Amino acid sequence: AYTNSFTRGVYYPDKVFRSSVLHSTQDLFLPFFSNVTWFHDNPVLPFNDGVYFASTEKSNIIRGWIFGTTLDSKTQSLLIVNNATNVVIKVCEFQFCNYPFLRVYSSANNCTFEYVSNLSEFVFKNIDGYFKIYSKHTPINLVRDLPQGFSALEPLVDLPIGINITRFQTLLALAYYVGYLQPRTFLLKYNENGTITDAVDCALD
């Protein structure tokens, strides 16, 4: 199924504070009024130039994401997972299960990382091997479509992982949306407190 992106998906492009300034930025963004997928046993999805992901439910039915070329331990893959004590990220050669849920994999062959720490919005970029996650959590009064109005994703973590990614999947446990980035010129309205409060997708119309 498909739906409107409704101008959701903007994020802070540069780690520079700017305020009360309209700034032109060229970057991978979700184009405005993009035609995003909505999923109502478990798909594997292409990564494209980059991913926008969101889900509306607080009950932690979602638990993570996995990314790579194979998702089968014949290469490395990224695992992002969340558990009752920690945020966890690692870059191991997991033998992932045909349905990955918390039991996400049978075995693992190498590793190079273990980082640790109601609509939930996420953006994943991979450039120069840095896999960059931005997110924000935002209130909603409806589930079957993305909410009206502007919302800037703050950078959450920024990891030098350097692995090749082309396919990905979402971990459940025992609805969500997906869109894909494209290179756009955007104009960002940084307000007095330096938050992006509006934007123009210059190639839209």
């Binding site: 802070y12 520079v16 504070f17 700017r18 305020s19 300034v21 330096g194």
Partner: protein, 49 residues
């Protein structure tokens, strides 16, 4: 004069009220001079007028 992780210039370092988000390290002028800087050890924000 200053060097801040390589950011080099001359300025009157002033305690900034600019509300940097925890990932941000520099702030910029329309000319791309650096308008404010995070101290690399105390992590406070300083204006560079």
């Amino acid at each position: 004069n200053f060097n801040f992780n390589g950011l080099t210039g001359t300025g009157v370092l002033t305690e900034s009220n600019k509300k940097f988000l925890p990932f941000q390290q520099f702030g910029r002028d329309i000319a791309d001079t650096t308008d404010a800087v995070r101290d690399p050890q105390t992590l406070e924000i300083l204006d560079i007028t």
